[PDB]
Design a binder for these strands. Structure first.
Lengths: 54, 152, 52, 114
RNA sequence: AAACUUGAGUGCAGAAGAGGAAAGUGGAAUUCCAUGUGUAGCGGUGAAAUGCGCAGAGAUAUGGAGGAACACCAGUGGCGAAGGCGACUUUCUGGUCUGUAACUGACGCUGAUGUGCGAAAGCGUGGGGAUCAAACAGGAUUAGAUACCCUGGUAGUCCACGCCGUAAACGAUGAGUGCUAAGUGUUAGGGGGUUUCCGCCCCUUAGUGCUGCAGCUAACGCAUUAAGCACUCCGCCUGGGGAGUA
Protein backbone atom coordinates (compact mmCIF):
# COMPACT_ATOMS: atom_id res chain seq x y z
CA UNK A 1 0.00 0.00 0.00
CA UNK A 2 0.93 3.70 0.13
CA UNK A 3 0.50 6.13 3.02
CA UNK A 4 -1.80 8.99 2.12
CA UNK A 5 -0.97 12.19 3.96
CA UNK A 6 -4.58 12.95 4.94
CA UNK A 7 -5.15 9.68 6.85
CA UNK A 8 -4.22 11.28 10.14
CA UNK A 9 -5.21 8.58 12.67
CA UNK A 10 -2.84 5.91 11.36
CA UNK A 11 -0.26 8.65 10.81
CA UNK A 12 -0.40 10.13 14.33
CA UNK A 13 0.30 6.86 16.13
CA UNK A 14 3.77 7.26 14.58
CA UNK A 15 4.26 10.84 15.79
CA UNK A 16 5.79 11.30 19.23
CA UNK A 17 4.22 12.53 22.47
CA UNK A 18 5.62 15.97 21.60
CA UNK A 19 5.55 15.95 17.78
CA UNK A 20 8.82 14.16 16.93
CA UNK A 21 9.18 11.01 14.82
CA UNK A 22 9.47 7.60 16.42
CA UNK A 23 12.36 5.67 14.85
CA UNK A 24 11.64 2.30 13.28
CA UNK A 25 13.84 0.82 16.03
CA UNK A 26 11.10 1.50 18.60
CA UNK A 27 8.06 1.28 16.29
CA UNK A 28 9.10 -1.82 14.36
CA UNK A 29 8.18 -0.96 10.77
CA UNK A 30 10.23 -1.92 7.73
CA UNK A 31 12.75 0.23 5.86
CA UNK A 32 10.75 1.37 2.83
CA UNK A 33 7.64 1.84 4.95
CA UNK A 34 9.46 4.26 7.27
CA UNK A 35 10.68 6.56 4.50
CA UNK A 36 7.39 6.40 2.63
CA UNK A 37 5.93 7.36 6.01
CA UNK A 38 8.32 10.25 6.53
CA UNK A 39 7.48 12.00 3.27
CA UNK A 40 3.82 11.85 4.33
CA UNK A 41 4.33 12.91 7.96
CA UNK A 42 6.14 16.04 6.73
CA UNK A 43 3.55 17.05 4.15
CA UNK A 44 1.06 16.77 7.03
CA UNK A 45 3.23 19.01 9.20
CA UNK A 46 3.09 21.62 6.45
CA UNK A 47 -0.71 21.72 6.21
CA UNK A 48 -1.24 21.77 9.99
CA UNK A 49 -2.78 18.32 10.33
CA UNK A 50 0.08 17.58 12.75
CA UNK A 51 2.25 20.00 14.73
CA UNK A 52 6.00 20.46 14.72
CA UNK A 53 6.14 20.56 18.52
CA UNK A 54 3.25 20.48 20.96
CA UNK B 1 45.75 -1.59 58.66
CA UNK B 2 43.83 1.46 57.42
CA UNK B 3 43.59 0.19 53.84
CA UNK B 4 43.02 -3.53 54.38
CA UNK B 5 39.79 -2.44 56.07
CA UNK B 6 39.11 -0.90 59.47
CA UNK B 7 41.12 -1.20 62.68
CA UNK B 8 39.42 -3.21 65.48
CA UNK B 9 38.55 -0.65 68.15
CA UNK B 10 39.27 -1.71 71.72
CA UNK B 11 37.41 -1.63 75.02
CA UNK B 12 38.04 0.73 77.93
CA UNK B 13 37.45 0.34 81.67
CA UNK B 14 34.78 2.51 83.36
CA UNK B 15 35.44 4.70 86.37
CA UNK B 16 34.95 3.34 89.91
CA UNK B 17 33.50 6.52 91.46
CA UNK B 18 30.91 7.66 88.91
CA UNK B 19 30.63 4.16 87.36
CA UNK B 20 31.02 5.77 83.95
CA UNK B 21 33.08 5.07 80.85
CA UNK B 22 32.92 8.78 79.97
CA UNK B 23 34.79 9.83 83.12
CA UNK B 24 37.76 7.52 82.43
CA UNK B 25 38.01 8.80 78.86
CA UNK B 26 38.21 12.30 80.34
CA UNK B 27 40.98 11.05 82.66
CA UNK B 28 43.01 9.77 79.71
CA UNK B 29 42.76 13.02 77.76
CA UNK B 30 43.77 15.23 80.71
CA UNK B 31 46.58 12.75 81.42
CA UNK B 32 49.47 14.92 80.26
CA UNK B 33 52.70 12.94 79.81
CA UNK B 34 51.53 9.55 81.09
CA UNK B 35 50.90 10.68 84.69
CA UNK B 36 47.74 8.81 85.63
CA UNK B 37 47.47 9.62 89.33
CA UNK B 38 48.45 13.29 89.25
CA UNK B 39 45.78 13.96 86.61
CA UNK B 40 43.02 11.74 88.04
CA UNK B 41 43.31 13.48 91.42
CA UNK B 42 42.63 16.81 89.71
CA UNK B 43 39.45 15.54 88.02
CA UNK B 44 38.36 14.08 91.37
CA UNK B 45 38.86 17.64 92.71
CA UNK B 46 37.28 19.29 89.65
CA UNK B 47 33.78 17.89 90.09
CA UNK B 48 33.46 18.66 93.80
CA UNK B 49 33.42 22.36 92.90
CA UNK B 50 30.84 21.38 90.28
CA UNK B 51 28.78 19.74 93.03
CA UNK B 52 29.48 22.78 95.24
CA UNK B 53 28.24 25.40 92.74
CA UNK B 54 25.26 23.21 91.79
CA UNK B 55 23.30 20.84 94.01
CA UNK B 56 23.10 18.08 91.40
CA UNK B 57 25.65 15.28 91.27
CA UNK B 58 28.24 15.86 88.58
CA UNK B 59 27.65 12.66 86.57
CA UNK B 60 24.38 14.26 85.50
CA UNK B 61 26.15 17.60 85.02
CA UNK B 62 28.99 16.14 82.89
CA UNK B 63 26.75 14.55 80.26
CA UNK B 64 24.58 17.69 80.36
CA UNK B 65 27.57 20.00 79.82
CA UNK B 66 29.08 18.08 76.90
CA UNK B 67 25.85 18.31 74.89
CA UNK B 68 26.57 22.03 74.48
CA UNK B 69 30.06 21.02 73.27
CA UNK B 70 29.38 18.16 70.82
CA UNK B 71 28.54 19.55 67.35
CA UNK B 72 26.33 17.90 64.74
CA UNK B 73 28.03 19.14 61.54
CA UNK B 74 31.71 19.51 60.69
CA UNK B 75 33.90 19.99 57.61
CA UNK B 76 35.78 17.23 55.80
CA UNK B 77 37.92 18.50 52.92
CA UNK B 78 37.43 16.77 49.56
CA UNK B 79 40.14 17.44 46.97
CA UNK B 80 38.01 19.02 44.25
CA UNK B 81 40.70 21.54 43.30
CA UNK B 82 39.12 24.80 42.18
CA UNK B 83 35.89 24.23 44.13
CA UNK B 84 35.29 25.18 47.76
CA UNK B 85 36.81 21.82 48.88
CA UNK B 86 34.90 22.02 52.19
CA UNK B 87 31.99 19.58 52.42
CA UNK B 88 29.69 19.87 55.47
CA UNK B 89 29.62 16.31 56.83
CA UNK B 90 27.74 15.03 59.87
CA UNK B 91 29.63 13.38 62.71
CA UNK B 92 29.91 9.65 63.41
CA UNK B 93 28.88 8.69 66.99
CA UNK B 94 32.42 7.69 68.03
CA UNK B 95 33.87 11.01 66.83
CA UNK B 96 30.78 12.67 68.35
CA UNK B 97 31.90 11.46 71.79
CA UNK B 98 35.61 12.22 71.34
CA UNK B 99 35.51 15.71 69.82
CA UNK B 100 33.39 17.06 72.68
CA UNK B 101 35.99 15.83 75.18
CA UNK B 102 38.70 17.51 73.09
CA UNK B 103 37.19 21.01 73.15
CA UNK B 104 36.32 20.72 76.86
CA UNK B 105 39.98 20.28 77.86
CA UNK B 106 41.77 22.35 75.20
CA UNK B 107 39.99 25.55 76.29
CA UNK B 108 40.13 24.66 79.98
CA UNK B 109 43.89 25.22 79.68
CA UNK B 110 43.51 28.89 78.65
CA UNK B 111 41.77 30.54 81.61
CA UNK B 112 42.82 33.07 84.24
CA UNK B 113 43.28 30.75 87.22
CA UNK B 114 46.32 28.47 87.17
CA UNK B 115 45.09 25.39 89.01
CA UNK B 116 43.09 22.85 87.02
CA UNK B 117 41.35 22.40 90.35
CA UNK B 118 39.17 25.21 88.95
CA UNK B 119 40.37 25.65 85.35
CA UNK B 120 38.30 22.60 84.44
CA UNK B 121 35.23 23.10 86.63
CA UNK B 122 34.63 26.68 85.48
CA UNK B 123 34.35 25.62 81.83
CA UNK B 124 32.08 22.70 82.79
CA UNK B 125 29.53 24.98 84.47
CA UNK B 126 29.84 27.28 81.46
CA UNK B 127 29.10 24.28 79.25
CA UNK B 128 26.36 23.28 81.69
CA UNK B 129 24.87 26.77 81.22
CA UNK B 130 25.49 26.77 77.42
CA UNK B 131 28.13 29.52 77.53
CA UNK B 132 31.87 30.05 77.90
CA UNK B 133 34.63 29.33 75.39
CA UNK B 134 34.28 25.66 74.51
CA UNK B 135 30.61 26.22 73.66
CA UNK B 136 31.26 29.26 71.47
CA UNK B 137 33.53 27.42 69.03
CA UNK B 138 30.80 24.84 68.44
CA UNK B 139 28.74 27.79 67.21
CA UNK B 140 31.82 28.86 65.21
CA UNK B 141 31.70 25.47 63.51
CA UNK B 142 27.94 26.02 63.21
CA UNK B 143 28.61 29.35 61.48
CA UNK B 144 31.23 27.85 59.13
CA UNK B 145 29.83 24.47 58.07
CA UNK B 146 26.32 25.99 58.10
CA UNK B 147 27.42 28.89 55.88
CA UNK B 148 28.81 26.70 53.09
CA UNK B 149 25.70 24.53 52.83
CA UNK B 150 25.99 24.14 49.04
CA UNK B 151 27.67 20.72 49.46
CA UNK B 152 25.13 18.67 51.42
CA UNK C 1 4.06 19.80 28.88
CA UNK C 2 2.28 17.26 31.08
CA UNK C 3 -0.04 18.42 33.87
CA UNK C 4 0.36 16.48 37.13
CA UNK C 5 -2.11 17.05 39.96
CA UNK C 6 -4.00 15.21 42.75
CA UNK C 7 -0.66 14.39 44.44
CA UNK C 8 2.34 16.05 46.08
CA UNK C 9 5.25 17.82 44.37
CA UNK C 10 7.80 15.08 45.12
CA UNK C 11 5.81 12.70 42.88
CA UNK C 12 5.11 15.12 40.02
CA UNK C 13 8.90 15.46 39.77
CA UNK C 14 9.20 11.69 39.26
CA UNK C 15 6.90 12.00 36.25
CA UNK C 16 8.72 15.10 35.02
CA UNK C 17 12.26 13.72 35.46
CA UNK C 18 11.47 10.88 33.04
CA UNK C 19 9.26 13.01 30.76
CA UNK C 20 12.40 15.05 30.04
CA UNK C 21 14.87 12.16 29.80
CA UNK C 22 12.55 10.68 27.16
CA UNK C 23 12.82 13.84 25.07
CA UNK C 24 15.35 15.58 22.87
CA UNK C 25 16.10 18.50 25.19
CA UNK C 26 19.02 17.65 27.49
CA UNK C 27 20.82 15.39 25.01
CA UNK C 28 20.16 17.99 22.29
CA UNK C 29 21.50 21.12 24.00
CA UNK C 30 24.54 19.23 25.31
CA UNK C 31 25.27 18.37 21.68
CA UNK C 32 24.97 22.02 20.63
CA UNK C 33 27.22 23.49 23.32
CA UNK C 34 29.90 24.01 20.66
CA UNK C 35 30.13 23.64 16.90
CA UNK C 36 31.51 20.28 15.89
CA UNK C 37 33.18 19.72 12.56
CA UNK C 38 30.86 18.46 9.75
CA UNK C 39 32.74 15.13 9.48
CA UNK C 40 33.35 14.39 13.17
CA UNK C 41 29.63 14.12 14.00
CA UNK C 42 29.32 11.44 11.32
CA UNK C 43 31.81 9.44 13.40
CA UNK C 44 30.21 10.58 16.67
CA UNK C 45 26.88 9.24 15.41
CA UNK C 46 28.72 6.12 14.20
CA UNK C 47 30.14 5.49 17.68
CA UNK C 48 26.67 6.13 19.15
CA UNK C 49 25.25 3.46 16.79
CA UNK C 50 27.90 0.72 16.63
CA UNK C 51 27.71 0.43 20.43
CA UNK C 52 23.87 0.68 20.40
CA UNK D 1 -4.94 39.08 39.53
CA UNK D 2 -5.20 37.03 42.73
CA UNK D 3 -3.99 33.39 42.55
CA UNK D 4 -3.33 33.00 38.82
CA UNK D 5 0.04 33.14 37.15
CA UNK D 6 2.96 31.66 35.25
CA UNK D 7 6.31 30.94 36.90
CA UNK D 8 9.34 31.13 34.60
CA UNK D 9 12.69 29.63 35.58
CA UNK D 10 15.66 29.26 33.25
CA UNK D 11 18.67 27.80 35.05
CA UNK D 12 21.59 28.00 32.63
CA UNK D 13 25.06 26.64 33.41
CA UNK D 14 25.41 29.76 35.59
CA UNK D 15 23.06 31.97 37.59
CA UNK D 16 19.62 30.41 38.05
CA UNK D 17 17.12 33.18 37.23
CA UNK D 18 13.40 33.13 38.10
CA UNK D 19 10.63 35.55 37.08
CA UNK D 20 7.07 34.92 38.21
CA UNK D 21 4.32 36.58 36.18
CA UNK D 22 0.59 36.38 35.51
CA UNK D 23 -1.09 34.00 33.06
CA UNK D 24 -0.75 36.63 30.29
CA UNK D 25 2.89 37.39 31.09
CA UNK D 26 3.58 40.81 32.62
CA UNK D 27 6.54 40.20 35.02
CA UNK D 28 5.00 40.37 38.50
CA UNK D 29 8.29 39.83 40.36
CA UNK D 30 11.73 38.38 39.76
CA UNK D 31 14.87 37.40 41.64
CA UNK D 32 18.22 35.83 40.86
CA UNK D 33 21.23 34.24 42.53
CA UNK D 34 23.22 37.45 42.06
CA UNK D 35 20.53 39.31 44.00
CA UNK D 36 21.33 37.17 47.07
CA UNK D 37 25.03 37.98 47.44
CA UNK D 38 26.29 35.09 45.30
CA UNK D 39 28.96 36.97 43.36
CA UNK D 40 30.25 34.37 40.92
CA UNK D 41 30.39 30.58 40.28
CA UNK D 42 28.44 29.83 43.47
CA UNK D 43 25.34 30.68 41.45
CA UNK D 44 25.55 27.36 39.54
CA UNK D 45 24.36 25.35 42.54
CA UNK D 46 21.01 23.82 43.54
CA UNK D 47 21.51 25.55 46.90
CA UNK D 48 21.33 28.89 45.07
CA UNK D 49 17.92 27.79 43.77
CA UNK D 50 16.90 26.92 47.35
CA UNK D 51 16.62 30.63 48.20
CA UNK D 52 16.20 32.42 44.86
CA UNK D 53 12.81 30.85 44.06
CA UNK D 54 10.73 31.94 47.05
CA UNK D 55 12.41 35.35 47.47
CA UNK D 56 10.64 36.45 44.29
CA UNK D 57 7.50 34.44 45.05
CA UNK D 58 6.99 35.58 48.64
CA UNK D 59 8.12 39.10 47.78
CA UNK D 60 5.45 39.50 45.10
CA UNK D 61 2.78 40.87 47.46
CA UNK D 62 0.94 43.01 44.88
CA UNK D 63 -2.00 40.72 44.11
CA UNK D 64 -1.61 37.51 46.12
CA UNK D 65 -0.78 35.45 43.03
CA UNK D 66 -0.34 32.18 44.90
CA UNK D 67 -0.50 29.60 42.11
CA UNK D 68 2.40 29.26 39.69
CA UNK D 69 2.25 26.32 37.17
CA UNK D 70 5.99 26.66 36.59
CA UNK D 71 7.84 26.69 33.24
CA UNK D 72 11.40 25.37 32.76
CA UNK D 73 13.50 27.08 30.08
CA UNK D 74 17.12 26.12 30.72
CA UNK D 75 19.66 23.30 31.10
CA UNK D 76 21.10 23.81 34.56
CA UNK D 77 22.11 22.13 37.81
CA UNK D 78 19.46 23.87 39.91
CA UNK D 79 16.63 22.91 37.56
CA UNK D 80 14.43 20.63 39.69
CA UNK D 81 15.75 22.17 42.93
CA UNK D 82 13.99 25.45 42.12
CA UNK D 83 10.52 23.85 41.99
CA UNK D 84 11.24 21.66 45.01
CA UNK D 85 12.12 24.87 46.85
CA UNK D 86 8.98 26.52 45.45
CA UNK D 87 6.80 24.37 47.74
CA UNK D 88 8.86 25.76 50.59
CA UNK D 89 6.84 28.85 49.74
CA UNK D 90 3.95 26.44 49.09
CA UNK D 91 2.23 27.85 46.00
CA UNK D 92 0.44 24.73 44.56
CA UNK D 93 2.67 23.84 41.60
CA UNK D 94 0.15 22.27 39.24
CA UNK D 95 1.61 22.16 35.70
CA UNK D 96 5.35 21.72 35.11
CA UNK D 97 6.54 22.35 31.55
CA UNK D 98 10.00 22.00 29.99
CA UNK D 99 9.62 24.74 27.38
CA UNK D 100 13.23 25.07 26.30
CA UNK D 101 14.42 26.52 22.97
CA UNK D 102 15.50 23.61 20.77
CA UNK D 103 16.52 24.57 17.22
CA UNK D 104 15.61 22.73 14.05
CA UNK D 105 19.32 22.97 13.11
CA UNK D 106 19.00 26.66 12.40
CA UNK D 107 22.16 28.62 13.20
CA UNK D 108 25.88 27.98 13.59
CA UNK D 109 26.87 27.42 17.25
CA UNK D 110 30.18 28.86 18.53
CA UNK D 111 33.63 27.24 18.43
CA UNK D 112 34.78 24.22 20.42
CA UNK D 113 36.57 25.05 23.67
CA UNK D 114 40.13 23.77 24.07
C1' A E 1 33.19 -13.63 -47.76
C1' A E 2 29.18 -15.88 -44.51
C1' A E 3 26.68 -18.06 -39.84
C1' C E 4 25.66 -17.68 -34.47
C1' U E 5 24.24 -16.01 -29.55
C1' U E 6 26.14 -15.70 -24.17
C1' G E 7 29.47 -10.22 -24.24
C1' A E 8 27.53 -5.16 -25.37
C1' G E 9 23.18 -2.25 -26.54
C1' U E 10 17.88 -1.29 -27.46
C1' G E 11 12.66 -2.98 -26.44
C1' C E 12 8.57 -4.42 -23.02
C1' A E 13 7.06 -4.62 -17.70
C1' G E 14 8.27 -3.33 -12.62
C1' A E 15 10.83 -0.75 -8.83
C1' A E 16 14.23 2.22 -5.23
C1' G E 17 16.95 6.82 -4.40
C1' A E 18 19.82 13.46 0.54
C1' G E 19 21.68 12.15 -8.28
C1' G E 20 21.73 17.17 -10.32
C1' A E 21 19.35 22.23 -12.00
C1' A E 22 15.61 26.19 -11.52
C1' A E 23 11.34 28.37 -9.17
C1' G E 24 8.06 28.46 -5.06
C1' U E 25 6.30 27.23 0.18
C1' G E 26 7.05 26.29 5.49
C1' G E 27 8.36 25.82 10.92
C1' A E 28 11.68 26.01 15.38
C1' A E 29 15.97 28.72 16.85
C1' U E 30 19.85 33.06 16.59
C1' U E 31 20.51 38.43 16.09
C1' C E 32 18.56 43.42 15.77
C1' C E 33 14.50 46.94 16.29
C1' A E 34 9.55 48.79 18.13
C1' U E 35 6.10 48.18 22.40
C1' G E 36 3.68 46.46 27.06
C1' U E 37 4.60 45.00 32.11
C1' G E 38 8.55 44.93 35.58
C1' U E 39 13.60 45.77 38.91
C1' A E 40 19.02 45.58 40.07
C1' G E 41 22.23 43.37 38.21
C1' C E 42 23.20 40.58 33.63
C1' G E 43 27.06 38.00 31.27
C1' G E 44 31.40 35.04 31.86
C1' U E 45 35.37 31.65 34.22
C1' G E 46 39.67 26.92 37.50
C1' A E 47 38.80 31.72 39.91
C1' A E 48 37.90 36.85 38.13
C1' A E 49 37.95 40.99 34.93
C1' U E 50 37.22 43.60 30.27
C1' G E 51 32.06 44.29 28.28
C1' C E 52 26.50 45.57 29.10
C1' G E 53 22.64 48.11 32.41
C1' C E 54 18.94 53.28 36.10
C1' A E 55 18.96 57.48 28.75
C1' G E 56 15.20 50.79 32.18
C1' A E 57 19.60 45.93 30.89
C1' G E 58 18.62 41.04 31.36
C1' A E 59 14.00 38.13 32.41
C1' U E 60 8.80 37.89 30.34
C1' A E 61 4.69 38.57 26.46
C1' U E 62 2.95 40.11 21.58
C1' G E 63 4.21 41.92 16.78
C1' G E 64 7.93 43.11 13.02
C1' A E 65 12.32 42.89 9.84
C1' G E 66 16.42 40.04 7.93
C1' G E 67 20.03 36.38 6.90
C1' A E 68 21.59 31.42 7.52
C1' A E 69 20.68 26.34 8.15
C1' C E 70 16.98 22.25 8.01
C1' A E 71 16.04 19.10 14.93
C1' C E 72 13.04 14.37 15.10
C1' C E 73 12.99 10.66 11.01
C1' A E 74 18.83 9.25 10.68
C1' G E 75 20.94 3.53 10.19
C1' U E 76 28.76 0.18 9.51
C1' G E 77 21.43 3.14 5.51
C1' G E 78 20.46 5.41 0.15
C1' C E 79 22.27 7.79 -4.39
C1' G E 80 26.70 9.72 -7.66
C1' A E 81 32.37 8.73 -11.75
C1' A E 82 34.80 11.46 -7.97
C1' G E 83 34.25 16.06 -5.19
C1' G E 84 29.82 15.18 -2.87
C1' C E 85 24.38 15.07 -1.67
C1' G E 86 19.61 15.86 4.39
C1' A E 87 12.81 20.76 5.31
C1' C E 88 8.73 20.49 1.70
C1' U E 89 6.30 21.05 -3.29
C1' U E 90 6.15 21.54 -8.70
C1' U E 91 8.60 21.63 -13.45
C1' C E 92 13.05 20.04 -16.39
C1' U E 93 16.74 16.10 -16.54
C1' G E 94 20.84 12.07 -15.76
C1' G E 95 22.17 7.06 -14.00
C1' U E 96 21.67 2.20 -11.69
C1' C E 97 19.01 -2.41 -10.36
C1' U E 98 15.25 -6.54 -11.18
C1' G E 99 12.28 -9.53 -14.49
C1' U E 100 10.82 -11.04 -19.40
C1' A E 101 12.68 -12.78 -23.44
C1' A E 102 10.86 -9.69 -28.67
C1' C E 103 14.96 -7.50 -31.43
C1' U E 104 20.41 -5.71 -33.40
C1' G E 105 24.33 -9.31 -34.27
C1' A E 106 31.05 -8.42 -31.49
C1' C E 107 28.51 -3.30 -32.31
C1' G E 108 33.54 -4.87 -27.07
C1' C E 109 37.51 -3.41 -23.27
C1' U E 110 41.45 -0.08 -22.07
C1' G E 111 42.77 4.62 -23.35
C1' A E 112 48.73 8.49 -24.40
C1' U E 113 47.85 13.71 -26.43
C1' G E 114 43.31 16.11 -25.80
C1' U E 115 38.68 17.83 -23.61
C1' G E 116 35.37 18.54 -19.20
C1' C E 117 33.88 18.03 -13.68
C1' G E 118 36.67 18.73 -9.10
C1' A E 119 35.98 19.86 -0.95
C1' A E 120 37.70 23.96 1.49
C1' A E 121 40.67 28.38 1.61
C1' G E 122 41.60 31.98 -1.99
C1' C E 123 40.97 36.00 -6.34
C1' G E 124 37.71 39.26 -9.64
C1' U E 125 32.98 42.09 -10.63
C1' G E 126 28.63 43.16 -8.01
C1' G E 127 24.99 41.77 -4.01
C1' G E 128 23.79 40.47 0.84
C1' G E 129 25.50 40.49 5.83
C1' A E 130 21.95 36.58 10.90
C1' U E 131 25.21 33.46 13.60
C1' C E 132 30.10 32.14 13.52
C1' A E 133 34.92 34.08 12.88
C1' A E 134 41.39 34.52 10.80
C1' A E 135 43.71 39.51 11.34
C1' C E 136 43.01 43.05 15.15
C1' A E 137 41.63 45.45 20.34
C1' G E 138 41.10 44.71 25.54
C1' G E 139 40.79 41.68 30.32
C1' A E 140 42.92 37.33 32.98
C1' U E 141 46.24 32.98 33.51
C1' U E 142 51.61 31.62 33.63
C1' A E 143 57.74 31.24 35.25
C1' G E 144 57.29 33.55 30.50
C1' A E 145 53.34 34.74 25.24
C1' U E 146 52.08 36.36 19.78
C1' A E 147 49.36 30.32 22.62
C1' C E 148 45.28 28.24 25.67
C1' C E 149 40.52 31.05 28.31
C1' C E 150 36.94 35.51 28.12
C1' U E 151 34.51 40.18 25.95
C1' G E 152 34.28 42.61 21.28
C1' G E 153 35.26 42.36 16.08
C1' U E 154 36.93 42.92 9.84
C1' A E 155 37.82 39.99 5.45
C1' G E 156 35.47 35.54 4.97
C1' U E 157 31.31 32.18 5.83
C1' C E 158 25.90 33.10 1.99
C1' C E 159 23.99 34.29 -3.33
C1' A E 160 24.95 35.49 -8.98
C1' C E 161 28.76 35.28 -12.87
C1' G E 162 33.78 34.36 -14.33
C1' C E 163 38.39 32.31 -12.36
C1' C E 164 41.84 29.29 -9.58
C1' G E 165 42.42 23.17 -10.16
C1' U E 166 44.99 22.11 -5.63
C1' A E 167 43.71 18.15 -0.10
C1' A E 168 45.73 12.37 4.61
C1' A E 169 41.02 14.41 -3.07
C1' C E 170 42.32 7.86 1.36
C1' G E 171 39.58 1.69 0.67
C1' A E 172 46.97 5.52 1.58
C1' U E 173 44.70 -0.22 -3.05
C1' G E 174 43.68 2.09 -11.78
C1' A E 175 39.99 0.06 -15.08
C1' G E 176 37.68 -4.47 -17.41
C1' U E 177 36.26 -9.80 -17.42
C1' G E 178 36.47 -14.74 -15.62
C1' C E 179 37.46 -18.33 -11.84
C1' U E 180 38.07 -20.18 -6.32
C1' A E 181 35.32 -23.07 1.54
C1' A E 182 31.54 -21.26 4.11
C1' G E 183 28.90 -18.49 8.15
C1' U E 184 26.33 -13.87 9.10
C1' G E 185 23.73 -8.66 9.33
C1' U E 186 21.33 -5.20 6.02
C1' U E 187 19.34 -2.41 1.31
C1' A E 188 16.65 -2.70 -3.71
C1' G E 189 13.91 -6.36 -6.46
C1' G E 190 12.18 -11.35 -8.42
C1' G E 191 10.28 -16.60 -8.25
C1' G E 192 8.54 -20.19 -4.77
C1' G E 193 6.35 -22.62 -0.50
C1' U E 194 2.97 -22.40 3.36
C1' U E 195 -0.43 -19.00 4.38
C1' U E 196 0.04 -14.58 7.41
C1' C E 197 -5.44 -12.14 8.51
C1' C E 198 0.82 -8.21 5.27
C1' G E 199 4.08 -12.39 9.15
C1' C E 200 7.83 -15.89 8.23
C1' C E 201 10.82 -19.90 5.65
C1' C E 202 13.94 -21.64 1.45
C1' C E 203 16.32 -20.37 -3.51
C1' U E 204 18.29 -16.56 -6.80
C1' U E 205 20.06 -11.26 -8.62
C1' A E 206 22.57 -6.50 -7.60
C1' G E 207 24.46 -3.39 -3.53
C1' U E 208 26.48 -2.66 1.34
C1' G E 209 29.07 -4.40 6.09
C1' C E 210 31.19 -7.97 9.93
C1' U E 211 33.65 -12.85 10.76
C1' G E 212 36.86 -16.81 8.39
C1' C E 213 39.49 -21.57 5.09
C1' A E 214 42.53 -22.43 0.77
C1' G E 215 45.96 -19.24 -1.23
C1' C E 216 48.93 -14.93 -0.53
C1' U E 217 52.19 -11.36 2.50
C1' A E 218 58.42 -9.17 4.96
C1' A E 219 55.12 -8.99 9.00
C1' C E 220 50.51 -6.75 10.31
C1' G E 221 46.87 -8.42 7.70
C1' C E 222 43.83 -9.46 2.93
C1' A E 223 40.39 -13.12 1.97
C1' U E 224 33.69 -13.87 -4.02
C1' U E 225 33.60 -5.88 -2.24
C1' A E 226 41.39 -10.11 -2.61
C1' A E 227 46.15 -7.61 -1.16
C1' G E 228 44.08 -15.43 -4.07
C1' C E 229 44.56 -17.63 -9.25
C1' A E 230 44.79 -15.51 -14.55
C1' C E 231 44.59 -12.36 -19.28
C1' U E 232 44.30 -7.24 -21.68
C1' C E 233 45.42 -2.00 -21.44
C1' C E 234 46.84 2.58 -18.89
C1' G E 235 49.43 5.62 -14.91
C1' C E 236 53.92 5.18 -12.09
C1' C E 237 58.63 3.60 -8.92
C1' U E 238 63.84 2.01 -8.83
C1' G E 239 68.91 4.63 -2.05
C1' G E 240 68.12 9.29 1.67
C1' G E 241 68.84 14.42 1.58
C1' G E 242 69.62 18.49 -2.02
C1' A E 243 63.72 19.20 -3.81
C1' G E 244 58.61 18.90 -5.98
C1' U E 245 63.66 23.39 -5.23
C1' A E 246 67.10 26.14 -9.84
Amino acid sequence: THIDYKDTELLKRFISERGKILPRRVTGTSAKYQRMLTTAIKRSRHMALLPYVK
Amino acid sequence: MPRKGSVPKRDVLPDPIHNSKLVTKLINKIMLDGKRGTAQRILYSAFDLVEQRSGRDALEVFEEAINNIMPVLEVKARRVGGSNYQVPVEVRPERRTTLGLRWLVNYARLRGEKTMEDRLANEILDAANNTGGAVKKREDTHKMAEANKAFA
Amino acid sequence: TVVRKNESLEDALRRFKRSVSKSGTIQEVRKREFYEKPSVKRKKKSEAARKR
Amino acid sequence: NIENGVAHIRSTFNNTIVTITDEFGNALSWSSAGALGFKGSKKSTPFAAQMASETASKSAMEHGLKTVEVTVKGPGPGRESAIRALQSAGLEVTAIRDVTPVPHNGCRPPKRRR
